[PDB]
Design a protein around this motif. Sequence first.
Motif, PDB file in Angstrom:
ATOM      1  N   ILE C  82       0.831  -1.196   0.000  1.00 35.42           N
ATOM      2  CA  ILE C  82       0.000   0.000   0.000  1.00 35.42           C
ATOM      3  C   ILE C  82       0.869   1.252   0.000  1.00 35.42           C
ATOM      4  CG2 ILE C  82      -0.244   0.074   2.509  1.00 35.42           C
ATOM      5  CD1 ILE C  82      -3.200   0.933   1.995  1.00 35.42           C
ATOM      6  N   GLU C  83       2.008   1.219   0.697  1.00 38.48           N
ATOM      7  CA  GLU C  83       2.897   2.378   0.697  1.00 38.48           C
ATOM      8  C   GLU C  83       3.465   2.639  -0.696  1.00 38.48           C
ATOM      9  OE1 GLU C  83       6.458   2.622   0.384  1.00 38.48           O
ATOM     10  OE2 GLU C  83       6.363   4.791   0.711  1.00 38.48           O
ATOM     11  N   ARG C  84       3.872   1.584  -1.414  1.00 36.72           N
ATOM     12  CA  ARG C  84       4.337   1.790  -2.789  1.00 36.72           C
ATOM     13  C   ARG C  84       3.223   2.306  -3.698  1.00 36.72           C
ATOM     14  NH1 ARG C  84       5.055  -1.510  -5.582  1.00 36.72           N
ATOM     15  NH2 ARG C  84       4.361  -3.452  -4.580  1.00 36.72           N
ATOM     16  N   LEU C  85       2.033   1.717  -3.602  1.00 35.72           N
ATOM     17  CA  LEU C  85       0.934   2.211  -4.423  1.00 35.72           C
ATOM     18  C   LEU C  85       0.643   3.666  -4.086  1.00 35.72           C
ATOM     19  CD1 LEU C  85      -2.308   0.316  -5.330  1.00 35.72           C
ATOM     20  CD2 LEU C  85      -2.387   2.709  -4.636  1.00 35.72           C
ATOM     21  N   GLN C  86       0.792   4.028  -2.810  1.00 40.16           N
ATOM     22  CA  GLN C  86       0.562   5.402  -2.387  1.00 40.16           C
ATOM     23  C   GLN C  86       1.619   6.347  -2.943  1.00 40.16           C
ATOM     24  OE1 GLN C  86      -1.842   7.018   0.870  1.00 40.16           O
ATOM     25  NE2 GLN C  86      -0.003   6.535   2.064  1.00 40.16           N
ATOM     26  N   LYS C  87       2.888   5.931  -2.973  1.00 47.20           N
ATOM     27  CA  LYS C  87       3.901   6.828  -3.527  1.00 47.20           C
ATOM     28  C   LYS C  87       3.648   7.066  -5.009  1.00 47.20           C
ATOM     29  CE  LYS C  87       7.387   3.298  -4.568  1.00 47.20           C
ATOM     30  NZ  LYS C  87       7.427   3.512  -6.042  1.00 47.20           N
ATOM     31  N   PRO C  96       0.294  15.116  -1.446  1.00 47.95           N
ATOM     32  CA  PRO C  96       0.160  13.741  -0.940  1.00 47.95           C
ATOM     33  C   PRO C  96      -1.264  13.308  -0.628  1.00 47.95           C
ATOM     34  CG  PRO C  96       2.138  14.721  -0.027  1.00 47.95           C
ATOM     35  CD  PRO C  96       1.576  15.717  -1.030  1.00 47.95           C
ATOM     36  N   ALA C  97      -1.635  12.117  -1.099  1.00 46.32           N
ATOM     37  CA  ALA C  97      -2.967  11.560  -0.915  1.00 46.32           C
ATOM     38  C   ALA C  97      -2.925  10.368   0.030  1.00 46.32           C
ATOM     39  CB  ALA C  97      -3.584  11.125  -2.249  1.00 46.32           C
ATOM     40  N   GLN C  98      -4.047  10.136   0.707  1.00 48.39           N
ATOM     41  CA  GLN C  98      -4.176   9.072   1.693  1.00 48.39           C
ATOM     42  C   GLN C  98      -5.266   8.097   1.261  1.00 48.39           C
ATOM     43  OE1 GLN C  98      -2.897   7.546   3.820  1.00 48.39           O
ATOM     44  NE2 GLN C  98      -4.404   6.572   5.166  1.00 48.39           N
ATOM     45  N   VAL C  99      -4.975   6.800   1.343  1.00 51.02           N
ATOM     46  CA  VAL C  99      -5.901   5.751   0.927  1.00 51.02           C
ATOM     47  C   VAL C  99      -6.094   4.779   2.085  1.00 51.02           C
ATOM     48  CG1 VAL C  99      -4.110   4.249  -0.045  1.00 51.02           C
ATOM     49  CG2 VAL C  99      -6.481   4.078  -0.847  1.00 51.02           C
ATOM     50  N   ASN C 100      -7.347   4.398   2.337  1.00 46.71           N
ATOM     51  CA  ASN C 100      -7.691   3.428   3.371  1.00 46.71           C
ATOM     52  C   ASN C 100      -8.529   2.294   2.785  1.00 46.71           C
ATOM     53  OD1 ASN C 100     -10.239   4.507   3.022  1.00 46.71           O
ATOM     54  ND2 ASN C 100     -10.410   5.389   5.077  1.00 46.71           N
ATOM     55  N   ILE C 101      -8.395   1.115   3.392  1.00 50.51           N
ATOM     56  CA  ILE C 101      -9.036  -0.109   2.922  1.00 50.51           C
ATOM     57  C   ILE C 101     -10.037  -0.587   3.963  1.00 50.51           C
ATOM     58  CG2 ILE C 101      -8.648  -2.348   1.837  1.00 50.51           C
ATOM     59  CD1 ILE C 101      -7.144  -0.118   0.473  1.00 50.51           C
TER      60      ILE C 101
END
Lengths: 125, 233, 204
Positions: C82-87, C96-101
């Motif tokens: 998730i950190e790589r997909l976020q970068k 910077p964007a934030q994603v939650n599952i």
Amino acid sequence: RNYGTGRRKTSTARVFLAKGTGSIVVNGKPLDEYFSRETSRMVVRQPLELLDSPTAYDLYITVKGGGISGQAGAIRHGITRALIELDDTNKPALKAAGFVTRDSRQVERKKLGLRKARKRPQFSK
Amino acid sequence: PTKIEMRDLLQAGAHFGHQTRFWNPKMGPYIFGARNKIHIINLEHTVKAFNEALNYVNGLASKKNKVLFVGTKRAASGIIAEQATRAGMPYVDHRWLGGMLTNWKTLRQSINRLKELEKQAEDGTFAKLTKREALERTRDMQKLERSLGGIKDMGGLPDAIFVVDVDHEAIAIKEAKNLGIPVIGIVDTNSNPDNVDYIIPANDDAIRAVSLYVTAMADAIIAGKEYAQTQAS
Amino acid sequence: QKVHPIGIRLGVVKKHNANWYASPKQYSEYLINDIQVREYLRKKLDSAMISNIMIERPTGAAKITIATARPGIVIGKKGEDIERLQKELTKMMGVPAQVNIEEITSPDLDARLVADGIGSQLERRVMFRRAMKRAVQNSMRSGAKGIKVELSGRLGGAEIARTEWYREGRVPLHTLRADIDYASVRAETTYGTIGVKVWIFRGE
RNA sequence: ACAGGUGCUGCAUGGCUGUCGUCAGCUCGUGUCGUGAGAUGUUGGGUUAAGUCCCGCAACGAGCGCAACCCUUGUCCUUAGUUACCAGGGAACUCUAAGGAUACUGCCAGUGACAAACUGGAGGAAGGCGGGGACGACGUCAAGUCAUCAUGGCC
């Protein structure tokens, strides 16, 4: 100082009823000057004549919005509203005429594919 | 109750039968004679057959087997309801649904719906519901109850089926034939006596006779039930 | 010939996937950014089984919510994936964007997941009738009130394309409050493209 | 390697759309009948905008359409009273916009298989679907789209 609201197909009008000479002023001006149509004058005076009280009570009228012949009907409906609020007994006879019924007819939607509300492009063989 | 007395049947009018033109040859032996273009069922044959049927039904009541009652005729229906209520056995009187026993599995859902409607009536469900919806639901309740009301507590297939007016009830006789479950029927002169284990050749057009026969059957079932209780205590 | 159930249901009984406010001029670019993010995320996560995605962009940082049947792999080991997909998602976008599952209690109930399964079945050449029947049966076992599956195309490599639909349960399309779930997917079978339509009705 | 093609094939296709048609229709399980294709249910007496509901009937139930849910006005109420409204500097009224209230053959009288319904009447702003819109069932036309886009083949 009875007050009421009457509308006709666009317009709103507010009517004030109290005892007095009975002179009628529309939008801060004389009624006869305000309306250029005899029919609309007749719509404005339609309810009072029915039970023979043309000059009994003073009338104060302000009517924004809509059009020349709709404002007259709105004024009529407002006069009926104030009269019915004043007196219970009149309501039945005024109902028999139906002036107390708000008009539900308004300009309807133009349906897409139709030139007008219902007019459809003619086809010729 | 096992023995049915002779004179009362004659007073009831069982002996009367249908007109000659609608006469059915197969009945012939049971009919002693015809008077004034009206056939007359013989007293002896009907008494003997009624005795045998009473013995059989008492035997079932001894073992607590459930016997269905069918009361379609306007006259038969009310008396069937009253007698079945006392007997404790299931009955259907207003109408006989096509393929009731053969398609009983489908009828299970309707019976359960009737039971749960009665439950929601019992537990005061109406107050939460709206007045119109409560009224329509109650009307559906009544419509279901008239048809399935008697058989709702059967919870199974009847070991024996008791029927009146076999000619009008022929469809139930066909269903019983397909199932193979014993059927006991009262057959009037016009009605066909085929495909019935036991024949009672009696007039069914008379309210008084219909009442007599149903009363006798219910009495036999009841006495069988007390005899069953005596063994337990 | 049939309107998209979700579009009509948005009005009353459903919540729009995208809920952000922007001015006229800002709106044009904001929508395009959102569509680009959705397409790239779908391509990246195609292998994983993923449900519909709810994206909210405020000013500056954007926020993304993703519901998937399989949370573990998408999270990775200790959030590494998730950190790589976020970068990468930060690189494509701006601040910077934030994603939650969010975990899904049941995958069968969600319309998209079943259609993805059927698409994979068609790709792997499992018989279409078997695919529809097993997919429909799983929902009835799960407890979904209704499921309907329609397949269009050259099923079985037939020269003439034909449409086969199967229903099991009440699936009132015209009841706007039926909150029916619809998703559409395409199966890339070698002979020809196959269209898979899934309708799931959980209730009111 | 390839990319690229608004090049061909809509008679290989996905997706979308017109159409019969917002016509009231299309069916399924079980049960029954016929050697069989298949029939019943879905027919029939009444009734509706409607396969709308009702009563009978070897049918008993279900789906999907119909109807309902949703949007928009038509009376009224609550909320807030500005950049609106001033009836007498005020907040009463209009209006604007988020909620509820009303309408349900509810009530009276009738015709009616003691039924569904229908006929008139009161009240109400509104009476029977109050007006308009959205919603287009199984399928029919190898109906329209390779030039939104996607994909098989072919070049």
